[PDB]
Amino acid sequence: EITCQENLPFTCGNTDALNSSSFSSDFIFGVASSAYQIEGTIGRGLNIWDGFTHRYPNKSGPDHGNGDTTCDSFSYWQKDIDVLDELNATGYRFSIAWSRIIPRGKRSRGVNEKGIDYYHGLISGLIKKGITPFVTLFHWDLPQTLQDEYEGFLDPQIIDDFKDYADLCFEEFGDSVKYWLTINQLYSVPTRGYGSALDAPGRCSPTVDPSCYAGNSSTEPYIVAHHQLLAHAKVVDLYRKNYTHQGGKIGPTMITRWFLPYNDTDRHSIAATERMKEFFLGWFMGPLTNGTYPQIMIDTVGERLPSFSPEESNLVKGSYDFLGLNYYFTQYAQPSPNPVNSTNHTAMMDAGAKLTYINASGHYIGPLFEKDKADSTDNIYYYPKGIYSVMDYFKNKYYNPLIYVTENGISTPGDENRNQSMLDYTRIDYLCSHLCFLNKVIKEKDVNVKGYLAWALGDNYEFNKGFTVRFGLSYIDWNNVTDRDLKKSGQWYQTFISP
Amino acid sequence: EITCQENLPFTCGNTDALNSSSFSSDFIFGVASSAYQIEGTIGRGLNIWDGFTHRYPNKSGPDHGNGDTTCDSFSYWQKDIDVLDELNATGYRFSIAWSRIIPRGKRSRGVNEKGIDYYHGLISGLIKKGITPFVTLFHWDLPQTLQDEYEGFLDPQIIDDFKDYADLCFEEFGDSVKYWLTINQLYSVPTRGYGSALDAPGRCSPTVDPSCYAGNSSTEPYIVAHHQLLAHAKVVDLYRKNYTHQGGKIGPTMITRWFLPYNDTDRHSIAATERMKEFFLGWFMGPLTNGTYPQIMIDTVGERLPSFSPEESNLVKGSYDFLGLNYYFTQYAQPSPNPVNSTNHTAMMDAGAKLTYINASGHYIGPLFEKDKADSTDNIYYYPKGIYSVMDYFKNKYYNPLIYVTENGISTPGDENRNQSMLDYTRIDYLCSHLCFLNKVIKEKDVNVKGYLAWALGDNYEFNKGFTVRFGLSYIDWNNVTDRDLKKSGQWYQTFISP
Ligand SMILES: *[C@@H]1O[C@H](CO)[C@@H](O[C@@H]2O[C@H](CO)[C@@H](O)[C@H](O)[C@H]2NC(C)=O)[C@H](O)[C@H]1NC(C)=O
Ligand SMILES: *[C@@H]1O[C@H](CO)[C@@H](O[C@@H]2O[C@H](CO)[C@@H](O)[C@H](O)[C@H]2NC(C)=O)[C@H](O)[C@H]1NC(C)=O
Ligand SMILES: *[C@@H]1O[C@H](CO)[C@@H](O)[C@H](O)[C@H]1NC(C)=O
Ligand SMILES: *[C@@H]1O[C@H](CO)[C@@H](O)[C@H](O)[C@H]1NC(C)=O
Ligand SMILES: *[C@@H]1O[C@H](CO)[C@@H](O)[C@H](O)[C@H]1NC(C)=O
Ligand SMILES: *[C@@H]1O[C@H](CO)[C@@H](O)[C@H](O)[C@H]1NC(C)=O
Ligand SMILES: *[C@@H]1O[C@H](CO)[C@@H](O)[C@H](O)[C@H]1NC(C)=O
Ligand SMILES: *[C@@H]1O[C@H](CO)[C@@H](O)[C@H](O)[C@H]1NC(C)=O
Ligand SMILES: [Zn+2]
DSSP: OOOOOOSSSOOTTOTTTSOGGGSOTTOEEEEEOOHHHHSOSTTSOOBHHHHHHHHSHHHHOTTOOOSSSTTOHHHHHHHHHHHHHHHTOSEEEEEOOHHHHOTTSSGGGOOOHHHHHHHHHHHHHHHHTTOEEEEEEESSOOBHHHHHHHOGGGSTHHHHHHHHHHHHHHHHHTTTOOEEEEESOTTHIIIIIHTSOSSTTOOOOTTTOTTOSSOOTTTHHHHHHHHHHHHHHHHHHHHHHHSGGGOOEEEOEEEEEEEEESSTTOHHHHHHHHHHIIIIIIHHHHHHHHSSOOHHHHHHHGGGSOOOOHHHHHHHTTOOSSEEEEEEEEEEEEEOOOOTTSTTOOGGGGGOEEEESBOTTSOBOSSEEEOOSSOGGGOEEOOTHHHHHHHHHHHHHTTSOEEEEEEOOOOEETTSOHHHHHOOHHHHHHHHHHHHHHHHHHHHHOOEEEEEEEEOSBOOOBTTTBTSEEOOSEEEETTEEEEEEEOHHHHHHHHHHOO | OOOOOOSSSOOTTOTTTSOGGGSOTTOEEEEEOOHHHHSOSTTSOOBHHHHHHHHSHHHHOTTOOOSSSTTOHHHHHHHHHHHHHHHTOSEEEEEOOHHHHOTTSSGGGOOOHHHHHHHHHHHHHHHHTTOEEEEEEESSOOBHHHHHHHOGGGSTHHHHHHHHHHHHHHHHHTTTOOEEEEESOTTHIIIIIHTSOSSTTOOOOTTTOTTOSSOOTTTHHHHHHHHHHHHHHHHHHHHHHHSGGGOOEEEOEEEEEEEEESSTTOHHHHHHHHHHIIIIIIHHHHHHHHSSOOHHHHHHHGGGSOOOOHHHHHHHTTOOSSEEEEEEEEEEEEEOOOOTTSTTOOGGGGGOEEEESBOTTSOBOSSEEEOOSSOGGGOEEOOTHHHHHHHHHHHHHTTSOEEEEEEOOOOEETTSOHHHHHOOHHHHHHHHHHHHHHHHHHHHHOOEEEEEEEEOSBOOOBTTTBTSEEOOSEEEETTEEEEEEEOHHHHHHHHHHOO
């Protein structure tokens, strides 16, 4: 019988008690990255994260940081491989920058051979060290040209441009890459990119944020989400019809959270909690498992919710071999009004829920996850049991899928000096406590989880935060980015992997 | 009788001997800037100078600098006005960033109202201080979307997108702006952007520079130059047909140089010198004055030189009310082979000339202009008489045009400390020696020159050089960009203007 801790102090950093041998022999352990966050702009065209961070520097991070140079994995990809080799990792998730291989967006405009060569060399280097690549086609970095031609995922033109990009990736890299992710965190671009305008491309209703160049936060999230699902599904169909000889697997990436009632004896909070599951997870998992959006979304969102045709429904339903599930934290849910006629209405209001990290009796859900220095009542707290609850829910609700945990990690402040930054015991605690619950759910609930990739390989540009936080298991000096030095967490993870 | 110095030491920094009163009462004196170089990316979309500097950081400058934040004239435009007011300047040349007012490139995709407001406030502030705006529509910063959709000026689609952009500018700003420049330095994008790939977008033949993503240095410069002329001419026709009520004037910007024979008794060097005038100046001025390219270009370039239809010829011929002439330096010319079958052939080779700053007897043409620390035999030297020779030539060869000198200036090294940087006596010498010759040519040759704008108002991002050189008449601290402090040159220029 497995017992796992939910509160500080944690004792799962002892590899005598928790290590890779606790999991099945074939289980993959590694780390993750994304292209905007690590590569730099050298050698690629411009994408909407370049555009957004440059047009709206205060939205890029408090330091106005961006991905222009970052950790320079364009130059230092071998050093990334070296970290993975030091870890004895068996997996690495990275993304392909669309703008590096097709700078002009549309494949018929030509490819960048040198960009293709960059990923060939990375892939070959990984495989030579026994590391399985997990490759994200689209980690938010849409070529700027496509956003300017037709507003990107706002328009159905995205589907064929994404398909042709993906086809090039399968053609060039699929002989070696056997695990593909289509779109990173399906929920995020619709809501943050087109709802709150916290993320690229930065569209919203005028009264939500007067700096947005255009948008409608009530309608566009739904349009974009719908196009994401269709573009994803078209790529999965292309993969499974035209690249079956490659013997690989493909799936989407979800951001997952668990949700608990703010007041577990209040029917209204219980209802809000179940609505959140539907609106947060079901928005995408309903289509992916059934070809339809959840009924509560149909009912609430009404004419703002697009319909799938019968052909589209069939294309989207079942459009995965596995799910990449990202998991960071859990929220309490309580009811909230949905003012659909307000000029500041957002899609996110349609769930009719307010989310907190403290429940009605004043209980904080778990240890600190992210401090918010401008408003401490907005601090985020984590909840290790949430990974158990999410995986159990996916198994039970969503037809026992094959799952890889494609991100899980925690930040430390960029204000810490290097010695403090390397002494990242809070990261060991977060990672181990989640791994304990992941082992527990696999054993107790028989969830088909076959790997775990911690966020992040190394310090990088963090969307929305610049270089003001660090997520890496290895440390990068922003004054001299060449080295990636394993932190205490990376050293712990090395021991966990090879105990 | 006016006597002007050609060699150090110069004594024209004495405003007792040379000042604004030496020129006609109406003559405009000011300074110049461009949008990529000064504004920053905040509040605008991405353009090909963002793309180029980010994809090819070693081509942005030795420091890998770029226009992301620069002097932040987005925030500090009032401080630019303040410099101009301190100078008692009567003119200011600035550019509109296309990506700030139409981030999606094509006008039908929507405009950025806040971008429009930015230029309205600048323009209104200038006029309130008695400063005449000279506004460049296109200072190289093409929206990235257009380059990615159709490769920008490589394709005739540029013409209508440029026209619709210009129409928006005339509509929004032409009630106040009475001097418009279409395209900055017509020669530069074809040759550097599409020939040598030193400049955005960075296209060339594969053996010219293997880093180029695509291109053909032998053909594309000509295509791009042809489209520039057509796009320019379509905008001038639009202006003069639809905006005549505004009572303003429009013209192109030329980069001018003079050319002297490397050996003034050698017929081959004399011939190369005359070819250079045709290939450098006539490439554009032939079309602008006659609707045809120079015969030597027709003959040499052959099938690589596009033809104008009779309608196009008529549109381009006479498509200016004035010329903005930029002038920095003069070169000696000697013959050079034109290897049209070589895989590394460039359009620039078609002139059949090699350019130097030292003549056959070892004479350097004038004082140092720009030191090249990697190769000192590649140092640039200036030649004050060249402004006289250029203006005389334009009057005689090109039908006595109205001229404004739209740039003239010199750099100092970014390695200098602030006190050295503010003690910019080399800049006084360059500016005064050229102003002396400009007065001389107006008086002696009756060239219709009606203003002079020195490059640059303040230190900025220099194309190709990052922040490794400074051109400003006012100093900017890159650690805190708010202030623009007049250098010795700016203080001199203040006295020259109001002696
Ligand atoms: C807030 O969360 C706390 C902690 O989960 C809940 O308190 C638990 O309540 C259960 C059922 O009453 C008790 O058996 C436990 O002993 C309590 N745990 C502790 C740490 O107090 C609490 O019920 C939640 N409040 C609401 C209103 O939902
Ligand atoms: C190189 O440039 C120098 C300077 O312009 C030329 O020298 C001048 O030559 C003229 C005509 O012979 C003489 O009257 C001057 O006195 C010379 N000036 C000085 C400073 O020497 C020289 O002829 C040029 N060489 C060539 C080969 O063209
Ligand atoms: C940040 O930038 C936007 C312009 O993009 C401006 O609207 C907003 O006021 C600025 N935010 C703060 C908090 O200053
Ligand atoms: C607009 O929304 C903000 C945040 O969503 C809220 O605090 C404010 O009350 C809203 N105003 C109206 C008019 O509803
Ligand atoms: C930068 O870091 C690398 C790796 O430690 C080191 O070899 C190189 O000398 C350092 N550069 C400077 C300028 O210190
Ligand atoms: C600069 O960058 C390009 C890649 O864009 C590379 O081809 C070239 O070798 C580098 N130049 C030098 C001098 O290192
Ligand atoms: C290619 O050109 C470079 C510079 O243009 C020159 O130095 C070299 O000799 C040329 N090679 C051939 C094959 O002509
Ligand atoms: C930056 O420069 C401005 C103008 O001199 C000054 O007022 C401001 O205090 C300076 N900022 C810092 C942080 O020194
Ligand atoms: Zn940047």
